[PDB]
PDB file of C-alpha atoms in Angstrom:
ATOM      1  CA  UNK A   1     -29.215  22.906  11.070  1.00  0.00           C
ATOM      2  CA  UNK A   2     -26.371  24.229  12.914  1.00  0.00           C
ATOM      3  CA  UNK A   3     -22.673  22.691  12.712  1.00  0.00           C
ATOM      4  CA  UNK A   4     -24.232  19.452  12.147  1.00  0.00           C
ATOM      5  CA  UNK A   5     -25.222  18.999   8.754  1.00  0.00           C
ATOM      6  CA  UNK A   6     -24.250  15.977   7.137  1.00  0.00           C
ATOM      7  CA  UNK A   7     -25.191  16.795   3.784  1.00  0.00           C
ATOM      8  CA  UNK A   8     -24.821  15.048   0.479  1.00  0.00           C
ATOM      9  CA  UNK A   9     -26.168  11.681  -0.910  1.00  0.00           C
ATOM     10  CA  UNK A  10     -27.424   8.529   0.990  1.00  0.00           C
ATOM     11  CA  UNK A  11     -25.315   6.596  -0.988  1.00  0.00           C
ATOM     12  CA  UNK A  12     -22.367   7.460  -3.338  1.00  0.00           C
ATOM     13  CA  UNK A  13     -20.466   5.624  -5.936  1.00  0.00           C
ATOM     14  CA  UNK A  14     -16.613   4.326  -6.032  1.00  0.00           C
ATOM     15  CA  UNK A  15     -14.650   4.406  -8.747  1.00  0.00           C
ATOM     16  CA  UNK A  16     -13.852   0.891  -8.042  1.00  0.00           C
ATOM     17  CA  UNK A  17     -17.577   0.520  -9.050  1.00  0.00           C
ATOM     18  CA  UNK A  18     -18.611  -0.104  -5.308  1.00  0.00           C
ATOM     19  CA  UNK A  19     -21.575   1.280  -3.746  1.00  0.00           C
ATOM     20  CA  UNK A  20     -20.819   3.606  -0.486  1.00  0.00           C
ATOM     21  CA  UNK A  21     -23.960   4.017   1.200  1.00  0.00           C
ATOM     22  CA  UNK A  22     -24.193   5.698   4.916  1.00  0.00           C
ATOM     23  CA  UNK A  23     -24.581   2.465   6.329  1.00  0.00           C
ATOM     24  CA  UNK A  24     -21.797   0.903   4.428  1.00  0.00           C
ATOM     25  CA  UNK A  25     -19.276   3.304   6.904  1.00  0.00           C
ATOM     26  CA  UNK A  26     -17.314   1.049   9.255  1.00  0.00           C
ATOM     27  CA  UNK A  27     -18.490   0.406  13.079  1.00  0.00           C
ATOM     28  CA  UNK A  28     -18.159   3.166  15.530  1.00  0.00           C
ATOM     29  CA  UNK A  29     -16.832   0.428  18.243  1.00  0.00           C
ATOM     30  CA  UNK A  30     -13.733  -0.607  15.914  1.00  0.00           C
ATOM     31  CA  UNK A  31     -10.783   0.297  16.689  1.00  0.00           C
ATOM     32  CA  UNK A  32      -8.413  -2.148  14.643  1.00  0.00           C
ATOM     33  CA  UNK A  33      -8.542   0.223  11.443  1.00  0.00           C
ATOM     34  CA  UNK A  34      -7.425  -1.768   8.296  1.00  0.00           C
ATOM     35  CA  UNK A  35      -6.993  -0.432   5.037  1.00  0.00           C
ATOM     36  CA  UNK A  36     -10.399  -1.225   3.629  1.00  0.00           C
ATOM     37  CA  UNK A  37     -12.461   0.609   6.849  1.00  0.00           C
ATOM     38  CA  UNK A  38     -10.193   3.634   6.356  1.00  0.00           C
ATOM     39  CA  UNK A  39     -10.587   3.812   2.573  1.00  0.00           C
ATOM     40  CA  UNK A  40     -14.314   3.474   3.358  1.00  0.00           C
ATOM     41  CA  UNK A  41     -14.552   6.426   5.548  1.00  0.00           C
ATOM     42  CA  UNK A  42     -12.218   8.751   3.699  1.00  0.00           C
ATOM     43  CA  UNK A  43     -14.134   7.783   0.398  1.00  0.00           C
ATOM     44  CA  UNK A  44     -17.134   8.839   2.244  1.00  0.00           C
ATOM     45  CA  UNK A  45     -15.984  12.488   2.958  1.00  0.00           C
ATOM     46  CA  UNK A  46     -14.317  12.717  -0.795  1.00  0.00           C
ATOM     47  CA  UNK A  47     -17.821  11.553  -2.326  1.00  0.00           C
ATOM     48  CA  UNK A  48     -19.928  13.851  -0.100  1.00  0.00           C
ATOM     49  CA  UNK A  49     -21.732  10.848   1.947  1.00  0.00           C
ATOM     50  CA  UNK A  50     -20.456  12.313   4.898  1.00  0.00           C
ATOM     51  CA  UNK A  51     -18.313  15.490   6.089  1.00  0.00           C
ATOM     52  CA  UNK A  52     -14.777  15.259   7.320  1.00  0.00           C
ATOM     53  CA  UNK A  53     -15.652  16.276  10.702  1.00  0.00           C
ATOM     54  CA  UNK A  54     -18.155  14.205  10.948  1.00  0.00           C
ATOM     55  CA  UNK A  55     -15.978  11.325  10.488  1.00  0.00           C
ATOM     56  CA  UNK A  56     -13.618  12.562  13.204  1.00  0.00           C
ATOM     57  CA  UNK A  57     -16.525  13.026  15.239  1.00  0.00           C
ATOM     58  CA  UNK A  58     -17.976   9.599  15.214  1.00  0.00           C
ATOM     59  CA  UNK A  59     -14.967   7.482  14.993  1.00  0.00           C
ATOM     60  CA  UNK A  60     -13.062   9.531  17.497  1.00  0.00           C
ATOM     61  CA  UNK A  61     -10.354  10.691  15.245  1.00  0.00           C
ATOM     62  CA  UNK A  62      -7.983  13.957  14.829  1.00  0.00           C
ATOM     63  CA  UNK A  63      -7.787  15.491  11.396  1.00  0.00           C
ATOM     64  CA  UNK A  64      -3.745  14.537  11.429  1.00  0.00           C
ATOM     65  CA  UNK A  65      -5.360  10.894  11.468  1.00  0.00           C
ATOM     66  CA  UNK A  66      -7.697  11.848   8.754  1.00  0.00           C
ATOM     67  CA  UNK A  67      -4.699  13.062   6.703  1.00  0.00           C
ATOM     68  CA  UNK A  68      -3.000   9.892   6.929  1.00  0.00           C
ATOM     69  CA  UNK A  69      -6.031   8.025   5.756  1.00  0.00           C
ATOM     70  CA  UNK A  70      -6.751  10.147   2.844  1.00  0.00           C
ATOM     71  CA  UNK A  71      -2.714   9.696   1.492  1.00  0.00           C
ATOM     72  CA  UNK A  72      -2.983   6.062   2.190  1.00  0.00           C
ATOM     73  CA  UNK A  73      -5.830   5.343   0.143  1.00  0.00           C
ATOM     74  CA  UNK A  74      -6.876   8.274  -1.915  1.00  0.00           C
ATOM     75  CA  UNK A  75      -3.304   9.734  -3.067  1.00  0.00           C
ATOM     76  CA  UNK A  76      -1.083   6.668  -2.077  1.00  0.00           C
ATOM     77  CA  UNK A  77      -1.176   6.132  -6.019  1.00  0.00           C
ATOM     78  CA  UNK A  78       1.330   9.044  -6.433  1.00  0.00           C
ATOM     79  CA  UNK A  79       3.402   6.472  -8.345  1.00  0.00           C
ATOM     80  CA  UNK A  80       2.525   8.176 -11.540  1.00  0.00           C
ATOM     81  CA  UNK A  81       0.216  11.206 -11.861  1.00  0.00           C
ATOM     82  CA  UNK A  82      -2.613   9.707 -13.614  1.00  0.00           C
ATOM     83  CA  UNK A  83      -4.777  12.187 -15.825  1.00  0.00           C
ATOM     84  CA  UNK A  84      -7.426  11.499 -13.210  1.00  0.00           C
ATOM     85  CA  UNK A  85      -5.043  11.626  -9.987  1.00  0.00           C
ATOM     86  CA  UNK A  86      -4.913  15.564 -10.557  1.00  0.00           C
ATOM     87  CA  UNK A  87      -8.694  15.471  -9.633  1.00  0.00           C
ATOM     88  CA  UNK A  88      -7.746  13.562  -6.594  1.00  0.00           C
ATOM     89  CA  UNK A  89      -5.010  16.330  -5.423  1.00  0.00           C
ATOM     90  CA  UNK A  90      -7.869  19.074  -6.449  1.00  0.00           C
ATOM     91  CA  UNK A  91     -10.238  17.709  -4.125  1.00  0.00           C
ATOM     92  CA  UNK A  92      -8.111  16.445  -1.404  1.00  0.00           C
ATOM     93  CA  UNK A  93      -6.472  19.199   0.384  1.00  0.00           C
ATOM     94  CA  UNK A  94      -3.114  18.964   1.646  1.00  0.00           C
ATOM     95  CA  UNK A  95      -1.135  15.476   0.879  1.00  0.00           C
TER      96      UNK A  95
END
């Protein structure tokens, strides 16, 4: 493939204990982006379900937008840097 290669598993696992498949991704027509829908998208990229540029592509988003998403979901727990929270900031780039 060239440019468009969305590699990774068909379904990834969440730290929540939930399963995030490539079918679990929120609708493309949706614009009322609630927290959980934003979470689903960002977790997908983080877990390697899809790629960041694929999310921005299909949902019609900007990178600064996705920056908000990952900051509001994955790295919003900056109350205390849990031992596992460092891993967040290791894979999450630019919070």
